[PDB]
Amino acid sequence: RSRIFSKLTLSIRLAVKEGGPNPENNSSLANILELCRSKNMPKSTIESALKTEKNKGIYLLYEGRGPGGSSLLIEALSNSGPKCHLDIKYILNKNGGMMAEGARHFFDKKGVVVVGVEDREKKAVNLERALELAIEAGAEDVKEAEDEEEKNLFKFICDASSLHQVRKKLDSLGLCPVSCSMEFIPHSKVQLAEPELEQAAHLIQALNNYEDVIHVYDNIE
């Protein structure tokens, strides 16, 4: 799909800015390229994204408010910050939201280590034990989650800086880290009703449809 390919181009460009255009030296870029190939993105399109100048485009993070007092984080890569800012504000405003003024940083980038509910010794890890190990590893928060199977899991949240150390300590303490990742976490969440939920989805969809948007984050529970 052409919209998918446009987003995947933005992701290639952002990965080249962070680690260079050689996927042998940039594992994040290598993962994106694999996904591109899995979606049947033509080589010509991949190469054009790969060979775009590292200095082209501005990476942008805009905060806004949606329907029911929700909070939004709009992640974008644009050739014109002013057009992108005006356009995102227009999309927010036309769908009942608003652009947050100033330096409201309602979302924080955080590290996230996912780990299974079983020790190296294949013994159960209950929440109380996950919490004690989180203290010892320097994790800021622990969430109980489920994957698509489904099956139980633990999400250990930390300072984005410390992602490296925490995964390592969790492994040294006997836990089984499945995956590492960066996520944008809001300070608090809101609950929306049905009329507000459908509106929020409409606004989010409109923002995802904008050409420069990579991702939209929200605090809707």
Residue numbers in the entry: 74 to 294
What do the paper's sentences say?
The translational activator of cytochrome oxidase subunit I (TACO1) was identified when a single-base-pair insertion at position 472 (472insC) was found in patients with late-onset Leigh syndrome (LS) and cytochrome c oxidase deficiency. TACO1 and its bacterial homologues belong to the domain of unknown function 28 (DUF28) family of proteins that share structural similarity, but their roles in cells are not known. We show that TACO1 is required for COXI translation, binds the mt-Co1 mRNA specifically and this interaction is required for association with the mitochondrial ribosome. Here we discover that TACO1 is an RNA-binding protein that binds to multiple adenine-guanine-rich sequences within the mt-Co1 mRNA.
To gain molecular insight into TACO1 and its RNA-binding mode, we crystallized the mature form of mouse TACO1 and determined its structure to 2.0 Å resolution by selenomethionine SAD. The structure (residues 74–294) has the shape of a hook that is comprised of three domains. Residues 27–73 were disordered, probably due to pronounced flexibility. Domain 1 is composed of three α-helices forming a helical bundle and domains 2 and 3 each contain four β-strands that face two α-helices forming 2-layer (αβ)-sandwiches. The centrally located domain 2 provides a platform for contacts with domains 1 and 3. In contrast, no interactions are formed between domains 1 and 3. Instead, a large tunnel with approximate dimensions 23 × 14 × 12 Å3 is formed between them. TACO1, with its open state, appears more flexible with a rather high averaged B-factor of ≈57 Å2 in comparison to ≈35 Å2 for Aq1575, suggesting that the interaction between domains 1 and 3 provides rigidity to the structure. Domain 1 is widely positively charged, domain 2 has both positively and negatively charged patches and domain 3 is predominantly negatively charged. Indeed, RNA binding was severely compromised with a quintuple mutation (R74A, S75A, R76A, S79A and K80A) at the base of the hook of domain 1.
